[PDB]
Amino acid sequence: DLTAQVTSDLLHFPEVTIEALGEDEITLESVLRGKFAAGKNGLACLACGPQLEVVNSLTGERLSAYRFSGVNEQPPVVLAVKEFSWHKRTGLLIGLEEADGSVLCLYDLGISRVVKAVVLPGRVTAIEPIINHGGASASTQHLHPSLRWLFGVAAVVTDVGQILLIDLCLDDLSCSQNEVEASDLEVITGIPAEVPHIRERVMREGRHLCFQLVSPLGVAISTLSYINRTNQLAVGFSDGYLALWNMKSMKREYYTQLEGGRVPVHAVAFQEPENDPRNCCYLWAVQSTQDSEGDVLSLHLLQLAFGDRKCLASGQILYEGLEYCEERYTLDLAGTSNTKLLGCQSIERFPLSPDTSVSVFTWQVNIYGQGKPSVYLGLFDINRWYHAQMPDSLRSGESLHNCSYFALWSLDSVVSRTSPHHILDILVHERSLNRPEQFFNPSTFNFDATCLLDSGVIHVTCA
């Protein structure tokens, strides 16, 4: 019965941060959302209505704050936030939902200002940087020639299924615009040739070039992730389908409904095994109804088999030539109760392939007529799953509490300690992950983590 132990007090955000977010009840009915940023700057971001607060992930200190304004005199909602660094600047890409449509912003943390913005032809559901520079360089050779003519590229997806690849025009240093002065896009359907001629005209007209992928419309995209090691954009749909798009060829390489059926794809996470005999790697896909009923939460491990590995001039390894993609593990966490995924995080250590690769899933279960939720952190070890002979599900009788390739931790001490504050996100600290065959079960892994709450941060150790 592995139980996390709390190692700090609750380190509160400053009052000014708490107060600013609590203006949630005017731009209401605004939900406070918060995530640790994926990059290497130790940031966590909280958003409520038009208000963004960037805080220090370990101390709770306020680092940056901004209240977005609406181009159409009505407050936008900060919907999506991603870390993004370019040149020698550190920033965030932000998707704003507006009454009309949407705006994609580039927010500079150095000066706490929006520096670029574009109007989106739809309602954004997710955003993802693809690359932070252009120019002819070994570092962009993995991308389709047409993207290489662009200068920074962000993917943006919408509630009707548009997939947009947008030029961030990071080569234009004369243009400093806020979210109110957002530029229009020039959207070309598919992927053209003669990009430079087009681009030059497009920018003389004060617009950003956008390639919209030829892809069916009508179903909302719910998840979006660029998988660096396979050069694939993963596009998860509200109907349970998952698309993989190769960003070299710009073609959809895979597209199938996950085994949970018509339930939205809520998150993905990539893993690479240490020793696999046919260039297989893995993509977890999480299906969840947490934004509606909250009755279904399931994990789906997709095995992606490729024909080759390629060392790029950059030094990076790339899986190339997708030969098959098939679901090889399924775990139902839910499906009265209410269950929601808090986080989904992959941690890999390299000594070629990582010698350690785990995915961490954190989820919360609320039973109706039960005040305090249970919170679980589960650690899946892909190599121990190999060692266990790749079972496709928990066996009869088998439990997460006693599984050779999965460790289950209770975060209930955190819940007791922090009530009634809500856990918004959980980050495991990669650098802390530390270790008779049973001994190499992941239950013996020690690690530290930080929970992001609505009012601060708090540190835990699992040992």
Swiss-Prot record:
GO biological process: cell division; hemopoiesis; mRNA transport; nuclear pore complex assembly; nucleocytoplasmic transport; protein transport; regulation of cytokinesis
Reported phenotype of the disruption mutant: Embryonic lethality before 7.5 dpc. Impaired proliferation of the inner cells of the blastocyst due at least in part to increased apoptosis.
Entry annotated with the keyword Ribonucleoprotein: no
Keywords for the protein's UniProt record, in alphabetical order: Acetylation, Cell cycle, Cell division, Centromere, Chromosome, Cytoplasm, Developmental protein, DNA-binding, Kinetochore, Mitosis, mRNA transport, Nuclear pore complex, Nucleus, Phosphoprotein, Protein transport, Transcription, Translocation, Transport
Domain of life of the organism encoding this protein: Eukaryota
Record region (Seven-bladed beta propeller repeats): 1-463
GO cellular component, one term: cytoplasm
Main location: nucleus
Annotated transmembrane regions: none
Subcellular location: Chromosome, Centromere, Kinetochore; Nucleus, Nucleoplasm; Nucleus, Nuclear pore complex; Nucleus matrix
Single annotated GO MF: DNA binding
Tissue specificity remark: Widely expressed with higher expression in testis, lung and kidney. Expressed in T-cells, B-cells and granulocytes in bone marrow.
Function: Required for the assembly of a functional nuclear pore complex (NPC) on the surface of chromosomes as nuclei form at the end of mitosis. May initiate NPC assembly by binding to chromatin and recruiting the Nup107-160 subcomplex of the NPC. Also required for the localization of the Nup107-160 subcomplex of the NPC to the kinetochore during mitosis and for the completion of cytokinesis. Has also been proposed to function as a transcription factor which may play a specific role in hematopoietic tissues.
Family: Belongs to the ELYS family.
Subunit relationships: Associates with the Nup107-160 subcomplex of the NPC.
Domain notes: The N-terminus forms a highly conserved seven-bladed beta propeller decorated with long loops and mediates anchorage to the Nup107-160 subcomplex of the nuclear pore, synergistically with the central alpha domain. The disordered C-terminus is responsible for the interactions with chromatin.
Annotated protein name in UniProt: Protein ELYS
Annotated gene: Ahctf1
Portion of the parent chain present: 3 to 493 of 2243
